[PDB]
Design brief:
This protein has helices spanning about 10-15, 30-40. The protein is mostly helical. It has one domain (about 1-53): Orthogonal Bundle (Transcription Termination Factor Rho, Rna-binding Domain, Chain A, Domain 1). The protein starts with 7 loop residues before the first helix and ends in a 14-residue tail after the last helix. This is Emerin. It is found in: Nucleus inner membrane; Nucleus outer membrane.
Length: about 55
């Protein structure tokens, strides 16, 4: 998509706009957040658990 142009704000606008379980946006767990954000919009996104699993 474009995880080589956006900056931190967008990460949080992509880790806080969908509400992905993200804590501190640090280097290590930086891609894991810009990477969850991939299926989140191309096959899955929330599908929260209505009953169990």
């Amino acid at each position: 998509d474009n995880y080589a142009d956006l900056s931190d704000t967008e990460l949080t606008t992509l880790l806080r706009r969908y509400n992905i379980p993200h804590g501190p946006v640090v280097g290590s767990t930086r891609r894991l957040y810009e990477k969850k954000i991939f299926e989140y919009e191309t096959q899955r996104r929330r599908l929260s658990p209505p009953s169990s699993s």
